[PDB]
Design a protein around this motif. Structure first.
Motif, PDB file in Angstrom:
ATOM      1  N   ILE A 181      11.427  76.191  98.053  1.00  0.00           N
ATOM      2  CA  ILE A 181      10.018  75.975  97.686  1.00  0.00           C
ATOM      3  C   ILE A 181      10.221  75.329  96.321  1.00  0.00           C
ATOM      4  O   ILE A 181      10.952  75.853  95.474  1.00  0.00           O
ATOM      5  N   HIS A 182       9.602  74.179  96.087  1.00  0.00           N
ATOM      6  CA  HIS A 182       9.819  73.487  94.832  1.00  0.00           C
ATOM      7  C   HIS A 182       8.606  72.701  94.337  1.00  0.00           C
ATOM      8  O   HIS A 182       7.633  72.475  95.072  1.00  0.00           O
ATOM      9  N   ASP A 183       8.702  72.314  93.059  1.00  0.00           N
ATOM     10  CA  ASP A 183       7.702  71.491  92.393  1.00  0.00           C
ATOM     11  C   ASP A 183       8.241  70.086  92.295  1.00  0.00           C
ATOM     12  O   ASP A 183       9.311  69.774  92.847  1.00  0.00           O
ATOM     13  N   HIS A 184       7.511  69.234  91.572  1.00  0.00           N
ATOM     14  CA  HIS A 184       7.884  67.841  91.460  1.00  0.00           C
ATOM     15  C   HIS A 184       7.872  67.256  90.068  1.00  0.00           C
ATOM     16  O   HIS A 184       7.611  66.063  89.894  1.00  0.00           O
ATOM     17  N   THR A 185       8.049  68.138  89.082  1.00  0.00           N
ATOM     18  CA  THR A 185       8.310  67.700  87.717  1.00  0.00           C
ATOM     19  C   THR A 185       7.339  66.681  87.172  1.00  0.00           C
ATOM     20  O   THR A 185       7.713  65.652  86.602  1.00  0.00           O
ATOM     21  N   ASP A 186       6.073  66.982  87.372  1.00  0.00           N
ATOM     22  CA  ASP A 186       4.989  66.132  86.870  1.00  0.00           C
ATOM     23  C   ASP A 186       4.991  64.695  87.371  1.00  0.00           C
ATOM     24  O   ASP A 186       4.432  63.784  86.732  1.00  0.00           O
ATOM     25  N   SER A 187       5.567  64.529  88.558  1.00  0.00           N
ATOM     26  CA  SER A 187       5.632  63.245  89.222  1.00  0.00           C
ATOM     27  C   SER A 187       4.884  63.206  90.533  1.00  0.00           C
ATOM     28  O   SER A 187       4.619  64.244  91.156  1.00  0.00           O
ATOM     29  N   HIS A 188       4.562  61.988  90.965  1.00  0.00           N
ATOM     30  CA  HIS A 188       3.939  61.767  92.263  1.00  0.00           C
ATOM     31  C   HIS A 188       5.071  61.842  93.263  1.00  0.00           C
ATOM     32  O   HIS A 188       6.194  61.377  92.966  1.00  0.00           O
ATOM     33  N   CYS A 189       4.820  62.420  94.428  1.00  0.00           N
ATOM     34  CA  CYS A 189       5.863  62.465  95.442  1.00  0.00           C
ATOM     35  C   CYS A 189       5.314  62.117  96.807  1.00  0.00           C
ATOM     36  O   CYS A 189       4.426  62.793  97.336  1.00  0.00           O
ATOM     37  N   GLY A 236      12.313  61.902 113.676  1.00  0.00           N
ATOM     38  CA  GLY A 236      12.165  63.342 113.855  1.00  0.00           C
ATOM     39  C   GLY A 236      10.881  63.924 113.309  1.00  0.00           C
ATOM     40  O   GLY A 236       9.899  63.204 113.096  1.00  0.00           O
ATOM     41  N   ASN A 237      10.904  65.229 113.034  1.00  0.00           N
ATOM     42  CA  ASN A 237       9.725  65.915 112.528  1.00  0.00           C
ATOM     43  C   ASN A 237      10.156  66.865 111.427  1.00  0.00           C
ATOM     44  O   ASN A 237      11.265  67.386 111.457  1.00  0.00           O
ATOM     45  N   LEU A 238       9.270  67.109 110.470  1.00  0.00           N
ATOM     46  CA  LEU A 238       9.553  68.075 109.420  1.00  0.00           C
ATOM     47  C   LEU A 238       8.367  69.007 109.273  1.00  0.00           C
ATOM     48  O   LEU A 238       7.232  68.566 109.405  1.00  0.00           O
ATOM     49  N   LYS A 239       8.637  70.274 108.989  1.00  0.00           N
ATOM     50  CA  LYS A 239       7.555  71.242 108.755  1.00  0.00           C
ATOM     51  C   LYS A 239       7.329  71.319 107.233  1.00  0.00           C
ATOM     52  O   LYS A 239       8.289  71.555 106.472  1.00  0.00           O
ATOM     53  N   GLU A 240       6.094  71.105 106.788  1.00  0.00           N
ATOM     54  CA  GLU A 240       5.777  71.200 105.368  1.00  0.00           C
ATOM     55  C   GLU A 240       4.931  72.449 105.186  1.00  0.00           C
ATOM     56  O   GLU A 240       3.890  72.594 105.855  1.00  0.00           O
ATOM     57  N   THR A 241       5.364  73.346 104.313  1.00  0.00           N
ATOM     58  CA  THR A 241       4.621  74.578 104.043  1.00  0.00           C
ATOM     59  C   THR A 241       4.157  74.486 102.599  1.00  0.00           C
ATOM     60  O   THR A 241       4.965  74.221 101.707  1.00  0.00           O
ATOM     61  N   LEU A 242       2.864  74.700 102.375  1.00  0.00           N
ATOM     62  CA  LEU A 242       2.297  74.603 101.020  1.00  0.00           C
ATOM     63  C   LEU A 242       2.123  75.969 100.367  1.00  0.00           C
ATOM     64  O   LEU A 242       1.776  76.944 101.032  1.00  0.00           O
ATOM     65  N   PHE A 243       2.388  76.037  99.074  1.00  0.00           N
ATOM     66  CA  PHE A 243       2.244  77.282  98.322  1.00  0.00           C
ATOM     67  C   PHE A 243       1.513  77.009  97.024  1.00  0.00           C
ATOM     68  O   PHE A 243       1.619  75.924  96.454  1.00  0.00           O
ATOM     69  N   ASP A 244       0.754  77.990  96.555  1.00  0.00           N
ATOM     70  CA  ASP A 244       0.098  77.820  95.269  1.00  0.00           C
ATOM     71  C   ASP A 244       1.116  78.169  94.188  1.00  0.00           C
ATOM     72  O   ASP A 244       2.151  78.806  94.450  1.00  0.00           O
ATOM     73  N   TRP A 245       0.848  77.725  92.961  1.00  0.00           N
ATOM     74  CA  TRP A 245       1.707  78.084  91.837  1.00  0.00           C
ATOM     75  C   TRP A 245       1.622  79.617  91.638  1.00  0.00           C
ATOM     76  O   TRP A 245       0.543  80.202  91.684  1.00  0.00           O
ATOM     77  N   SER A 276      -0.358  69.120  90.597  1.00  0.00           N
ATOM     78  CA  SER A 276      -1.748  69.549  90.479  1.00  0.00           C
ATOM     79  C   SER A 276      -2.215  70.154  91.797  1.00  0.00           C
ATOM     80  O   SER A 276      -3.088  71.022  91.813  1.00  0.00           O
ATOM     81  N   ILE A 277      -1.630  69.704  92.906  1.00  0.00           N
ATOM     82  CA  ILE A 277      -1.991  70.203  94.229  1.00  0.00           C
ATOM     83  C   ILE A 277      -1.290  71.533  94.499  1.00  0.00           C
ATOM     84  O   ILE A 277      -1.924  72.500  94.949  1.00  0.00           O
ATOM     85  N   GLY A 278       0.003  71.606  94.201  1.00  0.00           N
ATOM     86  CA  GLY A 278       0.722  72.842  94.479  1.00  0.00           C
ATOM     87  C   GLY A 278       2.195  72.585  94.694  1.00  0.00           C
ATOM     88  O   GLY A 278       2.700  71.555  94.241  1.00  0.00           O
ATOM     89  N   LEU A 279       2.869  73.528  95.351  1.00  0.00           N
ATOM     90  CA  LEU A 279       4.298  73.482  95.621  1.00  0.00           C
ATOM     91  C   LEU A 279       4.455  73.374  97.133  1.00  0.00           C
ATOM     92  O   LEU A 279       3.490  73.587  97.904  1.00  0.00           O
ATOM     93  N   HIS A 280       5.668  73.028  97.569  1.00  0.00           N
ATOM     94  CA  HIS A 280       5.912  73.031  99.010  1.00  0.00           C
ATOM     95  C   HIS A 280       7.366  73.254  99.352  1.00  0.00           C
ATOM     96  O   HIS A 280       8.244  73.200  98.491  1.00  0.00           O
ATOM     97  N   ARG A 281       7.593  73.551 100.631  1.00  0.00           N
ATOM     98  CA  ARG A 281       8.938  73.667 101.191  1.00  0.00           C
ATOM     99  C   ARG A 281       8.898  72.634 102.333  1.00  0.00           C
ATOM    100  O   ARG A 281       7.849  72.443 102.980  1.00  0.00           O
ATOM    101  N   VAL A 282      10.004  71.947 102.567  1.00  0.00           N
ATOM    102  CA  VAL A 282      10.063  70.973 103.659  1.00  0.00           C
ATOM    103  C   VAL A 282      11.262  71.393 104.506  1.00  0.00           C
ATOM    104  O   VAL A 282      12.340  71.607 103.970  1.00  0.00           O
ATOM    105  N   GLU A 283      11.101  71.472 105.827  1.00  0.00           N
ATOM    106  CA  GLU A 283      12.211  71.973 106.659  1.00  0.00           C
ATOM    107  C   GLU A 283      12.303  71.244 107.973  1.00  0.00           C
ATOM    108  O   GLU A 283      11.275  70.884 108.556  1.00  0.00           O
ATOM    109  N   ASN A 284      13.525  71.004 108.443  1.00  0.00           N
ATOM    110  CA  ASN A 284      13.676  70.443 109.792  1.00  0.00           C
ATOM    111  C   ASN A 284      13.958  71.697 110.640  1.00  0.00           C
ATOM    112  O   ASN A 284      15.073  72.226 110.654  1.00  0.00           O
TER     113      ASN A 284
END
Ligand SMILES: [Fe+3]
Length: 186
Positions: free
Chosen positions: A81-89, A96-105, A132-140
């Motif tokens: 689960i990670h952030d993006h260091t004040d950058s756009h991502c 393939g496909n990836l599962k994106e899970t969103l988490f609040d700070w 500003s939106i939040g954090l996420h985990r990305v998983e195959n």
């Protein structure tokens, strides 16, 4: 004038135009990334997998405005689960496909990080996230299909934080590139 990228090289040229200035039109960048139709032959050079974890392969340094890279996820590979260091991502699926899970700070108090939502990103779709939106985990989560994604981060960043799902505690992590411009960089 946003035109459809005809190839990965064309997309890269268009991105250099969209980042010529000091700000970022997120919707236009997302639209052009989504409009590029993944062509495996065009990015095979960057699709270097590792058996044990996903790899980050630098494709373009965006004249210093952004890092464009391809991530290769073996079956079952995933991120913290990670952030993006004040950058756009921006994240676009190439295969393939990836599962994106969103988490609040998390709050300062130790607590379980409970997911806000989750979704399946499919071939050619482009997702967007920022702190500003939040954090996420990305998983195959696939047991049979490797996934490949194209990521753009602006400004470029070399470090971020991984969050412990059980407590919300974070630790600084330094990102490393598996290859750069098609060359393995050990
Ligand atoms: Fe991310």
């Amino acid at each position: 004038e946003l035109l459809k990228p005809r190839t990965l090289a064309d997309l890269i040229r268009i991105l250099h135009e969209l980042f010529a200035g000091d700000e970022v039109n997120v919707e236009e960048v997302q639209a052009v990334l989504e409009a590029y139709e993944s062509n495996p032959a065009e990015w095979a050079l960057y699709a270097k997998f590792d058996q044990y974890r996903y790899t980050r392969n630098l494709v373009d340094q965006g004249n210093g405005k952004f890092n464009l890279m391809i991530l290769c996820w073996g079956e079952g590979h995933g991120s913290s689960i990670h952030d993006h260091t004040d950058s756009h991502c921006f994240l676009k699926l190439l295969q393939g496909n990836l599962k994106e899970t969103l988490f609040d700070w998390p709050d300062k108090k130790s607590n379980e990080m409970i997911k806000k939502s989750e979704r399946t990103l499919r071939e050619n779709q482009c997702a967007y996230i920022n702190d500003s939106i939040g954090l996420h985990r990305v998983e195959n989560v696939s047991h049979t299909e490797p996934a490949v994604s194209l990521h753009l981060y602006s400004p470029p960043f070399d470090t971020c934080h991984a969050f412990d799902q059980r407590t919300g505690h974070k630790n600084k992590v330094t990102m490393t590139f598996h290859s750069k411009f098609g060359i393995r960089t050990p």
